[PDB]
Amino acid sequence: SGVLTQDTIDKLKEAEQKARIDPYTKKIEENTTKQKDL
Amino acid sequence: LSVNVQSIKSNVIDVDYGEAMMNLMQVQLAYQASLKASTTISQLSLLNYM
């Protein structure tokens, strides 16, 4: 599959991203939640 | 921290399919031809018995 496997690996690149930014985002929504309602 | 180690784990143990299979192929190239060569070698041998 060549490039496709590499691109599949690129789509896993994003998997670490969502794995990473979600924890960031999980406390951003509390940052935003308890900022907005403030 | 777990993710860090998991990444490090993968870095150490897990193979690249393309690089490995590609290198599987490069060896298989010489290997497979040698197989056909082996047949041909025998075929030449069997030739001189008129």
User: Mutate which of A5, A10, A12, A18 to test chain B, going by most B C-beta atoms within 10 A?
Assistant: A5
Q: List CB contacts of A8: < 8 A, sequence separation 6 or more.
A: A1
Which residues 6+ apart lie within 8 Å of B7 measured at CB? A16
Q: Which structure tokens are listed for B17?
A: 């399919």
Structure tokens at B23: 């290198």
Instruction: Give me the sign of the Cα torsion angle A7, A13, A18, A24.
Output: negative
Resolution in A: 6.5
Closest CA to B21 of A15, A5, A11, A36: A5
Elucidated via: cryo-EM
Contacts of A19 in chain B (CB under 8 A): 3
